[PDB]
Every structure is written in structure tokens, then in C-alpha cells.
Design a protein around this ligand. Structure first.
Ligand SMILES: CC(C)=CCC/C(C)=C/CO
Ligand SMILES: CC(C)=CCC/C(C)=C/CO
Ligand SMILES: CC(C)=CCC/C(C)=C/CO
Ligand SMILES: CC(C)=CCC/C(C)=C/CO
Ligand SMILES: CC(C)=CCC/C(C)=C\CO
Ligand SMILES: CC(C)=CCC/C(C)=C\CO
Lengths: 143, 143, 143, 143, 143, 143
């Protein structure tokens, strides 16, 4: 069974394939903003929204991955494989969770409509040849 | 932030901490169940329910963990570390995800009321000593 | 084309694989059942029901496969090849036709509601740990 | 439990033995026509018609036989045996399956009364000695 | 994505796969026909019909292919390759575009109903063996 | 007969002559976004819009050109002419199809009104002398 974690929200993975991978901020940055903006709603006993319902799960899965990484650092004495596994986690799974958390936070903050429009516009930008594409990449803004 | 994945749905981890590991089916079995019963919805573009949302996220996180274990079995060359990490995944996070998938599937099937009452009754039963409890546990079923 | 032989009836091959292959009765037993209970209806000049139509066609396809088995055992002299081909036919196509004929006979005799709920229930039952399920396997009964 | 695949619709193997075996088209051509004209109806979750049900089952049985032929070509080492059985599966079976698909596709396109009138008339034509039958045989058409 | 250029219009390639190459006029002839009959529309600034849209696109693609063949005949200096590519174009894509232009022109002229019924009847005729079919094919015409 | 593939849509070739040739993204980029955004509508059996009706044809013609290029790579042994023809295709016909696919995708995504306004504004930009033209080239955006 294959599931798209955005189809439920009106998007797809080919639509987020527009954005490059080095575009998404650090998981730390994303979690800090998620806290600052939605702590009382994520720690709440309510189906505040599907985006909260899903952000909670993403945060908990990243927490389990962090627990795995620290478990490795404690147990595995072989530095080669210890570091290999920890780096694999933080790089690859970090990228996937960056995409996910970015989608959810940005949508909660701005609007899924605005976020899909941002995706198409950023696709325009990154497809445009450099000689003609502005340096002011599209930026999501409430102001 | 500290999140409880069930508070949003009306439960806690202290209400599921009593359920022993012997209670929970394989993760493969629970995934087969979820597929057979709710594939047309999980693979659908709808906020069918917070349960469907959370189940999608859980399935995807488990897929990520399995890909991690596979990557380990391929790359790592110290069987000590290989065994350690693969076992830790399939046991610890296997059990967490078994709890999760079971809670969601069972609520979807029976009802929040039914499942929470069953958790209460099973907790009474398992907090009771053998010599003072019936020998056959409580049971959730549709025949 | 990709046709699902049960989609037209409300089921799927995934749903019928929710049950093990060691649950379905032999083709001879199922054909005896079909004769006994619906001979004059399957031999009738009427669309008595879509289940009757499908059952007629499945009976005819299995008859052709058995005709092939006899033809092979007779003409094909190579014992190894006749063994392998007859074994493949029997085993594999028998699992398939066992699932099919079981579904059709059972639906005719009981109800699509009953038979689908039975598939679900028996799958959950056989995936559940023994100590937390009813002790007697589910049975599909008329009385 | 002898069953006539056409009695359920209003014909019988006697009425179709009128047409020779050299008459019926290639099974590939017939499946192409089926695709072209009824892909959406056969891949639909509806009892659109008994003809639809029967055609689905016929296509599926032919697919089973195709898988048998492939599995033979790969497993059976004896070239003689594999070629003999594959040539059988094609000639001897495809004959019946061509007859069947033809009946179904025709009675779906043109209708039962028309197909039966056509069978009677083609029987007249093909029974007439060659010295007295016109060159313009009966054709099954809409114009 | 896999597209069928006729599904949008109510047909398939399996419904036109029966039409043999001997059936289709020259591409030059079909283009002369399209011009003479619908130039005032194809050269017009209107969504006259999906057929006109598709016909415009087909004509332009064929013009591009002809410019390609011309560029080859000019630049390339190995007559082997020159012949190979020019012939491949004018035969393979010539035939595809003949199918296309014919379908569009004929639908525009006669009707979706008429053309699809003609395809059905011609497929019956061409799937029939010579000894069992009339000797003169079906015909689409306005006298 | 000369046809403008945009006059039907409210544009011209002198209007797109504004945009340079090195402005349009790769055909791969365009096809990827076309898939992600319009797969279910292009593979649909409906005149969803003239832009779909035309995008399907453009994609199919580019597919035929890719088939020609691979056919060349297989057949033509002479590397000089093989590479010459393949490069001609991918460069020149690629440019033409880039212009076309860009027009259609951008219009479906944003609005033909917005796209023509973008064309005139980009003409302003690229006509403006460098010393006074901003680096932030005009960019199409939903956000
Ligand atoms: C919520 C997800 C996807 C993972 C965390 C699982 C967990 C910590 C369960 C505790 O009972
Ligand atoms: C890990 C979870 C909760 C979901 C899937 C993450 C992923 C691979 C996204 C791809 O864009
Ligand atoms: C649709 C266009 C312009 C080209 C493709 C032609 C084709 C593949 C026809 C199959 O019958
Ligand atoms: C190849 C097709 C379908 C149309 C014409 C492409 C072209 C030369 C556009 C110029 O802007
Ligand atoms: C697979 C099915 C339904 C039938 C096999 C062919 C037959 C027995 C008769 C056709 O004239
Ligand atoms: C549909 C028919 C008559 C045969 C093929 C399917 C089958 C026997 C089991 C389902 O996989």
C-alpha cells in the first residue's frame, strides 16, 4: 500500500519535487517555529485540524529517530558503523521530515492555497534559465 | 513540546501502558489488516478522519524505519551493530507502532467508547493478581 | 486490461488474501457443493444471478484446465515435465479457483454482507494473539 | 454438471457450430476490440450486464492460460514438451475462447436478436452448395 | 503519463488498430482534404471544436517532421542513414498521422456515432476470415 | 496552410518572440510539472479544456520524436549522422516544444490573461536597456 502524505491535503510529491532538497530549513529551525507558534495547540487534547493531527505524528516519529540515534551513540562501540547510521538518519530521514514539517507548518501558517501557489511559482523560478530568473526567489510572507 | 499521540483522541499512554507486548499482533499483521479494511480511504484524497490521518502517518514512518533497517543490512559490515540496530527497531519501535496501529484500527472499527471501556476493563484485569482475577482476559471482537 | 474478479461483487483479491491459503476447501469438495446446491440453477437457461453467471464460467474454465491436464498426461511423455505442469496447474490455479468458488458459493448461500464480514473477522482472528481472542475459530453457518 | 456457456443468454453450442472454426478472429483482435469498446465497463465495479460478467471471467481465464504458457516456457526445460503444450493452449483453447468472446462482444454491440438472426442466416449461407450461394455473405453490422 | 489521443474523443487505439495501412490515404491527400474543407476554421482564432484543435496540432507536428526530413536530406552525407530515417518517418509516423487525420476529418464530417459504428463494423469484418466474410468491405461515404 | 498554435488561444508567435529561446525550461522539467499537476486530467476521457486537448497532442508528438531518436540510436551505426540527427532533434524541436508546452502549462496553471500580461511585461523587461532594467525578471506566481 502506497500513501501520499499530502494527497490528503491537496498536494502531491511531484508538486513538492519542484522545491530542491537544500531548500528546506533545518529540522531544528522547523521544530523551533512549530513550538513557538503551535505548542499550545499540538499539546492540546483536540482535533484542532488535520495539519495538527499530522504534525504531532511527524514530531513524534522524529523523536523516535532521535531516540534511536542516541541509543546507537550509547550502545554501538564501533565508531565506523555508529557514525554511519547516525549520519544516514540525520541526512536522509532529516530531508524527508524537512519536506514534511515544512509543508505542514507553512500550511498552518499561511494557507494550503497559498502554499500550492508558492510551489508552482517556485517551480517557475527554478525552471527559468538563470540569465532571466530574478535573484529574489519567491518567499512566503504574511506581511 | 511534549506530545501524547492519543490525548488528541481521548486516551493516554498510561491507559495503554498496561496492555502487554503479548497483546499486540505483528506489525505486518496490523498493516495487512489496515490495508484490507481501509485501503480505499487511506489511499484517498480525503480527511476521512483524524484516525485515517494518523494511520497514514504511522504507516509512512514505519516504512521509513524499514528502509532504514534495509539500508543497514546492506551497508553496515559489523554484524554486532547490524543485529543490534535491526533488533532494536523491530522490537522497541515495532512495539510502539503496534500500540499505535492497534489503537487506531480498533477505534475506527468499534468506537472510542468501546475501546476506552475495554482499556479500562483490561487495566483492572491486568492490575489484579492471577489468584484474584478470572483466568481468561477481556476480549474485543465482532465474532 | 486489469480486471478484478470480485470488484464487481464488493470484494478484492487483497481482501480474500486476508485469509490463508490453507483455509479454502478443495476444488472437488467445492464442485460437489455447487452441484448439490445449485445444479438446476447453473444448468438453467436464465441469468439467475451474477454469482450464478460467474460460477458457471469458473466451472467451465476449471473444466478446461482439467482437460488440459489429461491431454498433457497422455500426449506429453516426459514424466518430469508432465509432473511439473500438472502440479503447477493443480496447486496454483487451485488456490485461485478455490478462493473464487468459495466466494461465489458462500455468497449465494449466506449473503455478501455475511461473507465479507466473515472474511474480515476471520482475518483479524487469525492475526490476533490466541489468549485475547475467542477460542473457537469463526464458522459460517445457516442455523 | 455440464453447462452451456450460451444457454444463459439464448444460444447453444449447436447454434454456434454453424459457424466454422476458420471464421472466428484472432483472440488478440477480440481482446483489442473488448478493450476499445468496453474497457470502462469491464473495469467497473458494477454488474453492468451478464455479458459483462461473463466477458470478465473469460478474459481472466485466458490470462491464467497466458501465465501458464509463460511459466512453462521458463520452467519446462524440454523444448518439445513446452512447445507442444503452448501450441495446444493457443490452438485448441483459443478456438473456444474466440467463439466465446465473439459471442459476447457481438451480443453486446449488436444484440441478441441480431446475433441469432445472423447465425441462422450464416448457417443457410454455409449450407448452400457453393454453386448457389452469393459472394456477399451475411455480415454483422450497424449501418 | 500514458495518453491515448482518441480516449478524449470516445475511441481507442485498439478500435483503430484493425484498420490496415491500405485503408488510409496519403498524408498529402489527407492534408489537402483538411485544407479544402476546414481551412477557414483551422486558420481561425477560435476553439471551433476539440477536433479542430487536435487537427491543428497534428498538422503542425507533421510539418515539423517534414522539416526534419528535409534537414536530413540536406545535411547528412551517408545515404544509408538518410534513406533509413526518411523512410522511417514517412512510413511509421506517416501511418500514425494518417490514422489521426482520418479519425479527426471523418468525425468532423460524419459524426462520432457514425464513425465509431463504422469502426465496430469494420473490425467485425476484418476479424472475420475471407471465406466467411463478404468480399467488399464496409464503406463510409457521402456519395 | 499556415496555422498559429496560439491564435486559437488568444496569442501569436510574435508575442512569444518576446521571450528568448534560452528562457524556456527543459522539456523534462515541463513534462514533470505537467505530470504532477495534470496527469489525471490528461489521462482522462474528457475534453477537459482546449489546453488539455493540445497538451496531450504535444506530449504525444514529443514521444514520437523520442521514439525516433531511440530508433536512430539502435539502427544507425554511423555515429556522425546518428549523433547529428539526435542532437538536431533535441535542440531545435526541443526548443519549439519548449515554447509550446510552456505556453500550455503556464496557461492552465495561471490564466491565459495572466500569461499574455506576463509576455508583454517580459518584453518590456528584455527591451529595457540593461543599465535601467531590474535584475528581478518578471516571474509567474500563484502566491
Ligand atoms: C506517533 C508516531 C508516528 C510515532 C511514535 C509512537 C509512540 C511514541 C507511541 C507511544 O505509545
Ligand atoms: C515519515 C513520515 C511521517 C512520512 C513520510 C515522509 C516522506 C518520505 C515524505 C516525502 O516527501
Ligand atoms: C497525437 C499526435 C500529434 C501524434 C501521435 C500519433 C499517434 C501516436 C497515433 C496513434 O494512433
Ligand atoms: C510541434 C507542434 C505540436 C506545434 C508547433 C510547434 C512550434 C514550431 C511552435 C513555435 O512556437
Ligand atoms: C472460460 C469459459 C467460460 C469457457 C471455456 C470455453 C467453453 C467451454 C466454451 C466456449 O464455446
Ligand atoms: C476469473 C476466473 C474465472 C479466473 C481467474 C481468477 C481466479 C481463478 C482467481 C482470482 O485470482
Amino acid at each position: 500500500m502506497d500513501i501520499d502524505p499530502y494527497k490528503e491535503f491537496g498536494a502531491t510529491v511531484e508538486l513538492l519535487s519542484f522545491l530542491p532538497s537544500d531548500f528546506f530549513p533545518s529540522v531544528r529551525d522547523l521544530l523551533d517555529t512549530a513550538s513557538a507558534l503551535y505548542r499550545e495547540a499540538l499539546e492540546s487534547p483536540e482535533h484542532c485540524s488535520p495539519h495538527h493531527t499530522a504534525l504531532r505524528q511527524a514530531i513524534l516519529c522524529w523523536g523516535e529517530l532521535m531516540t534511536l540515534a542516541t541509543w546507537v551513540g550509547v550502545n554501538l562501540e564501533d565508531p565506523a558503523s555508529r557514525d554511519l547510521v547516525v549520519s544516514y538518519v540525520n541526512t536522509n530521514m532529516g530531508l524527508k521530515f524537512r519536506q514534511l514539517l515544512w509543508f505542514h507548518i507553512s500550511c498552518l501558517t499561511f494557507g494550503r492555497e497559498t502554499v500550492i501557489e508558492y510551489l508552482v511559482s517556485f517551480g517557475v523560478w527554478i525552471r527559468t534559465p538563470p540569465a532571466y530568473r530574478p535573484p529574489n526567489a519567491p518567499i512566503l510572507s504574511t506581511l
